[PDB]
DNA sequence: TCGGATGTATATATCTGACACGTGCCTGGAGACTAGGGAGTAATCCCCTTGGCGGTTAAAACGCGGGGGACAGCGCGTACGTGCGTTTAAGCGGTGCTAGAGCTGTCTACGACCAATTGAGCGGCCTCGGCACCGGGATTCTCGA
DNA sequence: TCGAGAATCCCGGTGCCGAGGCCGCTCAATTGGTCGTAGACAGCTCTAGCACCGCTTAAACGCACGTACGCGCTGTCCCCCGCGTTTTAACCGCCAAGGGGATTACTCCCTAGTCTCCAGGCACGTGTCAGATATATACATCCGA
């Protein structure tokens, strides 16, 4: 049971709908792998910090509070989860 | 044989997607992506579903803000179409890199 | 070596369905829409022999261990042993009317394995009309592609659910069985099972448009219920490119695969397995069959009767015509000199 | 300018399962009492901020000419939307099960705390040389031929 | 492709004030001791996270196709730059004067801490209507002649 993919699992039309909510009229073609790279570079840091909290707490599952504190260190604070 | 001119359907898409509030990415591929890049720092982890939802919310909000600033850049360069150099310029000026 | 350019064709016979080279690669039989026994010569690029056989598209064809006996499979379950001298029928009885594969044992032209469309693979003797049905675990797929190995030891029976089941050619011994998933969502419909000519490095085509290279030695090392990793994963990078047919080289060194979409074909190796060349073609052509020659880079490409051939990597140069000519690459300045100025009775018929 | 073809609010009928509301009960907040120590408050002094006066010059201000950047119209053929038809895997139910989170009980090794010295780091005082500074001559990039 | 020439870039002599070092000393950090408890650890439970399975259909995907625009080109024109000439106030050194900020000594009253007590908040168990959802239907708008 080893996963090795689904970074491509983010489809093309989903990024289109995110651009439409963003207020975008006309998109090039070269944007998509750029956007996937930006997304993965974003996620890596938060995952490192949540793993660090969980490892210090001596547990095996990841709660929501750990994600909240990891976001809180970044300056991007989230409301609505405790 | 009825066909619209290009852009009109895009504008009404913009209207209804700014009207609605929900998630825009299917949950299982995002979940498998999270487990994939979580595998490397430590093996055999478990996840409350709420944490996955929180990650999805934060990432989607971040991307929307990035697209807004990119669109401002592309309007300033007197175009309509968005380029990856505009994305690079926005991430340069914001100070993330 | 790796064939490159146009080379023309031999489109002498239309409605071509399948094509098969003999044991030495040197003959060719093409059953057509009518299903005739049409034979060629290769150095002449000429037709050797045409024999009318039936009216139906004869799907499955195979040569013999000497390269002198044959087998046929039309739409009407006609499964006889055939010959290259007269080519006459021996056996014919009922099967389900879509028939996929018949297959001689590679050390005995008595044992033959008949694979129908939605039935279990059935192993027949050719001494008589005996038939031996191999066991199926699922009985819900009804699509278990089976094949003898190159030697004649085992039968590799794999379902449409990615499950491998190895059977021995006479006693059905499950010496190995496993299942494969990648980028793990679920299993994959097995497209085909392949075998090389030198050794046991082989591969599996799967419906994820990904081709995974294996080796039966490590399979027997793990035996039953191991986790055999692929030697090499082959796929298309830019696009999907769904596959119709794949094949090795004449020893299993190059691996060239035929797409089912574009008539523009892709070449790999075994060890590296790099996409070394895209052999292009006309976009308005439907690729239907691919064959490869052992000691010659022949690409027999049936595209609706059109059998076109690309055969190169031989580029002529000098020093064989004029061995005095020493072809430098760039400017070679030098001075060749550091000072610029017995009765052996040798056999001539030693064979 | 008119005319049809639309996606779009608009009116109404029905279920339902989150939201609002009673209920027992307890653990945490209120009421009195006590010290003792943090902080308020009155001198006080001397230092460091403000204020002013001439000199001088280096820098700011003001014209002038011009030629190189901003910019607006044209022209193309390229890349990307729109619509349709064809696959597939997300999604929605049902079941199992079990590692693992969570609460309980017991003790004990480990940090809070109180004299006591002592040496270690901090204020004060020379000094002498690395760098400031000036003259002077070799070098070298630019710009009209 | 060239010489003239105007900034630069080593080289060498002068001198000088600020690191660096030395010294003298108060205060705080260490030693040695007790002691009350945070947490380390063992044990039991039960509940969500995972795994598997079957069915469906919404959703993705490929493919022409036709068009509109991003970029290039070319001409324009004017305004910002390089230079010379003249004013002026920034600066530096210097002088005086006085308010305010550290500064210590001295009460004192305000909050930690204790104990007793008792009810507002909380888990739990209800019902029931606000909104979701389905259905017809005026109508607002957009592309084409």
From Swiss-Prot, chain A:
Signal peptide: none annotated. The modification N6-butyryllysine is found at residues 12, 25, 58, 60, 72. The modification N6-propionyllysine is found at residues 12, 25, 58, 60, 72. Demethylation is performed by JMJD6. The modification N6-lactoyllysine is found at residues 12, 58, 72. The keyword Membrane does not apply. Its main location: nucleus. The modification N6,N6,N6-trimethyllysine is found at residue 1. The modification N6-succinyllysine is found at residues 12, 58, 72. The modification N6-glutaryllysine is found at residues 12, 40, 58, 60, 72. The modification Phosphotyrosine is found at residues 32, 69. The modification N6,N6-dimethyllysine is found at residue 1. The keyword Ubl conjugation applies. Keywords: Acetylation, Chromosome, Citrullination, DNA-binding, Hydroxylation, Isopeptide bond, Methylation, Nucleosome core, Nucleus, Phosphoprotein, Ubl conjugation. Transmembrane segments: none annotated. There is a cross-link at residue 12 (Glycyl lysine isopeptide (Lys-Gly) (interchain with G-Cter in UFM1)). GO terms for biological process: nucleosome assembly. The modification N6-(2-hydroxyisobutyryl)lysine is found at residues 12, 25, 40, 58, 60, 72. GO terms for cellular component: nucleosome; nucleus. Core component of nucleosome. Nucleosomes wrap and compact DNA into chromatin, limiting DNA accessibility to the cellular machineries which require DNA as a template. Histones thereby play a central role in transcription regulation, DNA repair, DNA replication and chromosomal stability. DNA accessibility is regulated via a complex set of post-translational modifications of histones, also called histone code, and nucleosome remodeling. The nucleosome is a histone octamer containing two molecules each of H2A, H2B, H3 and H4 assembled in one H3-H4 heterotetramer and two H2A-H2B heterodimers. The octamer wraps approximately 147 bp of DNA. This is Histone H4. It comes from Xenopus laevis (African clawed frog). The lineage of its organism: Eukaryota, Metazoa, Chordata, Craniata, Vertebrata.
UniProtKB/Swiss-Prot annotation, chain C:
The keyword Cell membrane does not apply. The keyword Zinc does not apply. Keywords: Chromatin regulator, Isopeptide bond, Nucleus, Phosphoprotein, Repeat, Transcription, Transcription regulation, Ubl conjugation, WD repeat. GO terms for cellular component: histone methyltransferase complex; MLL1 complex; MLL1/2 complex; MLL3/4 complex; nucleolus; nucleoplasm; nucleus; Set1C/COMPASS complex. The modification Phosphoserine is found at residue 339. Changing residue 346 to E: Significant reduction in its ability to stimulate KMT2A methyltransferase activity in association with WDR5 and ASH2L. It is found in: Nucleus. Residues 342-351 are annotated as: Interaction with WDR5. GO terms for biological process: DNA damage response; response to estrogen; transcription initiation-coupled chromatin remodeling. The modification Phosphothreonine is found at residue 241. WD repeats lie at residues 11-52, 53-92, 137-177, 185-224, 238-280, 282-320. GO terms for molecular function: histone binding; transcription cis-regulatory region binding. Ubiquitously expressed. There is a cross-link at residue 118 (Glycyl lysine isopeptide (Lys-Gly) (interchain with G-Cter in SUMO2)). Residues 319-341 are annotated as: Interaction with ASH2L. In embryonic stem (ES) cells, plays a crucial role in the differentiation potential, particularly along the neural lineage, regulating gene induction and H3 'Lys-4' methylation at key developmental loci, including that mediated by retinoic acid. Does not affect ES cell self-renewal. Component or associated component of some histone methyltransferase complexes which regulates transcription through recruitment of those complexes to gene promoters. As part of the MLL1/MLL complex, involved in mono-, di- and trimethylation at 'Lys-4' of histone H3. Component of the SET1 complex, at least composed of the catalytic subunit (SETD1A or SETD1B), WDR5, WDR82, RBBP5, ASH2L/ASH2, CXXC1/CFP1, HCFC1 and DPY30. Core component of several methyltransferase-containing complexes including MLL1/MLL, MLL2/3 (also named ASCOM complex) and MLL4/WBP7. This is Retinoblastoma-binding protein 5. It comes from Homo sapiens. The lineage of its organism: Eukaryota, Metazoa, Chordata, Craniata, Vertebrata. The chain holds residues 12 to 380 of 538 of the full protein.
